[PDB]
């Protein structure tokens, strides 16, 4: 989506987390702004020595490369449970003899 989502100066609406106190789980989501603590002292809500604001914005500019350009990604996970099937693919048909 380099021709669609990139902006002069970087698309700051798309961000991501760089540091977290623990690893996430499968399909887990977390939008907290807690300062990543490394030392024993309290961060006092501000980053610095052994403290860091974990979220940062993306540098999606029009001059980005293949590795840095924006890619609209979608993950399609399928579930097979005890409940009956709610979604299926299309079936073929033909003329009526």
């Amino acid at each position: 989506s380099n021709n669609l989502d990139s902006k002069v100066g970087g698309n700051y609406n798309y961000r991501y987390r760089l540091f977290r106190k623990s690893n996430l789980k499968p399909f887990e989501r977390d939008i907290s702004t807690e300062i990543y603590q490394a030392g024993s002292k309290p961060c006092n809500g501000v980053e610095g020595f052994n403290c860091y604001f974990p979220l940062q914005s993306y540098g999606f500019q029009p001059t980005n490369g293949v590795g840095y350009q924006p890619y609209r990604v979608v993950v399609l996970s399928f579930e097979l449970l005890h409940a009956p099937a709610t979604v299926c693919g299309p079936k073929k048909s033909t003329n009526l003899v």
């Binding site: 970087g10 760089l18 540091f19 990543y36 490394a38 030392g39 610095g48 020595f49 052994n50 860091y52 940062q56 540098g59 500019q61 001059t63 980005n64 490369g65 293949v66 590795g67 840095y68």
Partner: protein, 597 residues
């Protein structure tokens, strides 16, 4: 948990922020060089000042992480770049006075000019006038007037400015834990905290001294050869056993004998290798000269260029209204966006220059995946040394015959090889001791061994001993010759030319063995050898994340500069220079001068 998280986290914050901010200054420089305008130049300086201020604000946290008990080489090298204050150690008056000196020194050097004693109305500027007098003109009087007048008009004025430049710079380096600003330049190669690959700052002094004596057997024979040829053109001033005059070297600073090729031709009857006429008949242009050049880079096994690389590059000067800088320069705009600026023409000089600039891109593109502070070369030598090895192989006639520019019927013999090989020695062998001369003199000035009044006295003495060169007129204590050089007045390092020169043949020997070339290196051609480019990229991708000595150990087989591959390149030339020097004296005699009586 531990303190290690602070450095790993802080560097990622800087590697995220310094990445985009630095590129804004790079692309701003691209816009200015592509379109020299009052609007682009303002964004260039504003962007640089913006990023420059960010570097100093970030040092407040870089200094709060002691690297004393830390062994992580990645953490040490990155923070060490920011922990250094540089010019911020002194007050604003001392730092501003330093830039006032460099700005004034660059103006006096740039605006230099000399009028003839018989034509006071015709002054020739530094460029293109006086460079043509020392390079193209063969007149003894014109070469002498351009030399001596330049020292009096430009050399004397830079002497009091060079004094403030040294004393102000020494205070900056000493505050940053150095012996002097001479040792500061030597700190580019420093290595600490690695077993078996450490490197002291002052070790460069013994290295240039060691390699200098190994160059002397090849240099003393070439010095006698060029002296014998110049003696035939200037017999009333040059003795067959004396020194070479300084104003007959080929330039206004005495660095290269490349312009003396017309006076020192080995065989003026035999032809040389030149595909100027061959390219125009095939209807080659700037793009095709660049495209077929890429085939050599892909033939050796290096990565190819991106589609945006060629599409956004510059191939000519887009009009005078939007005149661009036609100088060759390999640009790294960032985010994988690499480009080159060049006003390429259909000539062999631009054929090899394209490979040279493309080689610079192969250097930067290799370690482009490294962190921002580590997305740089290990040293100034590696940056420019890799550029020449790719162009010299392309200049080999074996590659031209495969590409089809040089016809297959072109005969090759030992006579023609000396015409090309001797032409390079005038550039390499005729410059290696000169760089060792200047940096050894400057290093003694920064340390303070030579008093400020004895600059011209010791400079003339070093010229007679090291290079065997004498001034055309005697200079008193008020002159300052090396201050009139571009690299000196603009606060640039010249030792890189010595290191880049020897590193060039070192890397070439490593690839010639990879491509399985037999014989001297002058006939080497790594084209169509996939293993050659593959072994190179393993070294190019290191960047500055590991010691430079480690890069040389596993590639060229050494941990510092060496003269062995130099003599291997000029092996048959040593037999030719010996044969030519049979009717002259090898070396030089310090008792001769052109003004002697």
């Amino acid at each position: 948990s531990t303190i290690e998280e602070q450095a790993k986290t802080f560097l990622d914050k800087f590697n995220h922020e310094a990445e985009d901010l630095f590129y804004q200054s790079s692309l701003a420089s691209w816009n200015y060089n592509t379109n020299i305008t009052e609007e682009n130049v303002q964004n260039m300086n504003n962007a640089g000042d913006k990023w420059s201020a960010f570097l100093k604000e970030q040092s407040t946290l870089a200094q709060m992480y002691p690297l004393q008990e830390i062994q992580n080489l990645t953490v040490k090298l990155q923070l060490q770049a920011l922990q250094q204050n540089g010019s911020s150690v002194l007050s604003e008056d001392k730092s501003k006075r330093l830039n006032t000196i460099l700005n004034t020194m660059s103006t006096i050097y740039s605006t230099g000019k000399v009028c003839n004693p018989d034509n006071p109305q015709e002054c020739l500027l530094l460029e293109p006038g006086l460079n043509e007098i020392m390079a193209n003109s063969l007149d003894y009087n014109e070469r002498l007037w351009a030399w001596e007048s330049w020292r009096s008009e430009v050399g004397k004025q830079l002497r009091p400015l060079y004094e403030e430049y040294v004393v102000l710079k020494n205070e900056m380096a000493r505050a940053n834990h150095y012996e002097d600003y001479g040792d500061y330049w030597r700190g580019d190669y420093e290595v600490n905290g690695v077993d078996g690959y450490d490197y002291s700052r002052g070790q460069l002094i013994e290295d240039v001294e060691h390699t200098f004596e190994e160059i002397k057997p090849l240099y003393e024979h070439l010095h006698a050869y060029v002296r014998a040829k110049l003696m035939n053109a200037y017999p009333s001033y040059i003795s067959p056993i004396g020194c070479l005059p300084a104003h007959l070297l080929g330039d206004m600073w005495g660095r290269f004998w490349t312009n003396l090729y017309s006076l020192t031709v080995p065989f003026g009857q035999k032809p040389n290798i030149d595909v100027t006429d061959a390219m125009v008949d095939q209807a080659w242009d700037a793009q095709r000269i660049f495209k077929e050049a890429e085939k050599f880079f892909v033939s050796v096994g290096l990565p190819n260029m991106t589609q945006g690389f060629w599409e956004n590059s510059m191939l000519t000067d887009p009009g005078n209204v939007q005149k661009a800088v036609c100088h060759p320069t390999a640009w790294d705009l960032g985010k994988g966006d690499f480009r080159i600026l060049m006003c390429t023409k259909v000539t062999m000089d631009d054929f090899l220059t394209a490979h040279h600039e493309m080689g610079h891109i192969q250097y930067d593109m290799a370690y482009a995946a490294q962190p921002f502070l580590l997305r740089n070369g290990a040293n100034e030598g590696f940056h420019e040394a890799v550029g020449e090895i790719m162009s010299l192989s392309a200049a080999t006639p074996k590659h031209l015959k495969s590409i089809g520019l040089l016809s297959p019927d072109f005969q090759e013999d030992n006579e023609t090889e000396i015409n090309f090989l001797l032409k390079q020695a005038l550039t390499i062998v005729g410059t290696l001791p000169f760089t060792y001369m200047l940096e050894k003199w400057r290093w003694m000035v920064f340390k303070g061994e030579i008093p400020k009044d004895q600059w011209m006295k010791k400079w003339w003495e070093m010229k007679r001993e090291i290079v065997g060169v004498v001034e055309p007129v005697p200079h008193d204590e008020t002159y300052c010759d090396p201050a009139s050089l571009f690299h000196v007045s603009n606060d640039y390092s010249f030792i890189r030319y010595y290191t880049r020169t020897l590193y060039q043949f070192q890397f070439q020997e490593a690839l010639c063995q990879a491509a399985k070339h037999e014989g001297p290196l002058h006939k080497c051609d790594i084209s169509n050898s996939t293993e050659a480019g593959q072994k190179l990229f393993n070294m190019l991708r290191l960047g500055k994340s590991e010691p430079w000595t480690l890069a040389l150990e596993n590639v060229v087989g050494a941990k510092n500069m060496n003269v062995r591959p130099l003599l291997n390149y000029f092996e048959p030339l040593f037999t030719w220079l010996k044969d030519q020097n049979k009717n002259s004296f090898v070396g030089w005699s310090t008792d001769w001068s052109p003004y002697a009586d």
